[PDB]
């Protein structure tokens, strides 16, 4: 049987970056030449592996992480990067062995009145560990006094909403990102 990569890149909807979606791929074959051959992906950067030389490599598990961010923030989906996304939403380790794939989806994830259902985490006391998925809705205590779940001054909701309008610039248009993590071997080419 073939690997279900079509269910990820082709999903009619994508998850927010703070609650990023992950697909565990095991016990199947897959040809990665089909993916790189397509020039629809604006970004396609592999780390510690060759794109074409992947059909001859077997891996124990292959993780596919998919979410949506801004065009300006695609540069943060890479090892050793900082920023609101890499620190508080999706962090890649320094020894990352995989590939980062992204493409512009301003035609899909952008309402004319503004698509606000794609969110990101704006407040966090410390950065995320690699592959950490924080989905807490707890109010952020930025002041000396506690919040007790009462959103207000020095007590802000930790998440912020993307303002995805089709009139936005490329850096502000939504980009659908898929991050492949190459970890008995069950996924070959």
């Amino acid at each position, epitope marked *: 049987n073939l690997c279900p990569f079509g269910e990820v890149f082709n999903a009619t909807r994508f998850a927010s970056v703070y609650a990023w979606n992950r697909k565990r791929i095991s016990n199947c074959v897959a040809d990665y030449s089909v993916l790189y051959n397509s020039a629809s992906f604006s970004t396609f950067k592999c780390y510690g592996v060759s794109p074409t030389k992947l059909n001859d490599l077997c891996f124990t598990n292959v993780y596919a992480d998919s979410f949506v961010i801004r065009g300006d923030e695609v540069r943060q989906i890479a090892p050793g990067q900082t920023g609101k996304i890499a620190d*508080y939403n999706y962090k890649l380790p320094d020894d990352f062995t995989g590939c980062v794939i992204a493409w512009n989806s301003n035609n899909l994830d952008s309402k004319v009145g503004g698509n606000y259902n794609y969110l990101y985490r704006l407040f966090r*006391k410390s950065n995320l560990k690699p592959f950490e998925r924080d989905i807490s809705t707890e109010i952020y205590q930025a002041g000396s006094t506690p919040c007790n779940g009462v959103e207000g001054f020095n007590c802000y909701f930790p998440l912020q909403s993307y303002g995805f309008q089709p*009139t936005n*610039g490329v850096g502000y248009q939504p980009y659908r990102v898929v991050v492949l993590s190459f970890e008995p071997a069950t996924v070959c080419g």
Partner: antibody
Amino acid sequence: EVQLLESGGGLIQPGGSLRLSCAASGFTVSSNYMSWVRQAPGKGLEWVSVIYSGGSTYYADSVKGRFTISRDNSKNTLYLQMNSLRAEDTAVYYCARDHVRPGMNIWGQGTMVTVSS
Amino acid sequence: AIRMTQSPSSLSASVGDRVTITCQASQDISNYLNWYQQKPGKAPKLLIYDASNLETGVPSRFSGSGSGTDFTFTISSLQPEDIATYYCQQYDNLPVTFGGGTKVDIKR
């Protein structure tokens, strides 16, 4: 009582060093976005550096490698270590709690750093 | 790096006149543009945030409009105490860049 009180400015020879301390009251520095912004005499405003709530630091091109920003949780104080100072670093140095949401933007009053011999 | 251009550089108008300054962005900055009022000697004071939203406590005579790359900052009826230098800043994309500033004087 929300306010930023800053001190540490003065005269210093070129190439010298000088640290600027910005003590805070009314909010936690280690939990907020903090920024240093300098204004040359008679000129406009110029962004200098940023520390995130998580701790990530960002610097402008003109002070990168020379300036450093940090903070102390026990004292609730924002710092700006300045090294290899040049004559073009002479300005007033405001420390400000970066605007992120409705009404949290507060600026200090700045100190006068005069790099001269 | 983004470069904010601000027109006009200087300005003089009578009390009660409509005052309008512009701030064009070098790149698309969405609506993440703030406006500051710095009276002589004092620190900058945030008046408008996110292009069009009025900070709590600013008088109604201050306005803001624009998105993408062209923005406006309007004073309904100019008042004597409104004299200051007004700057525009973008903060979403790093580094944070300011405008040249607009000096405003009263025509008495």
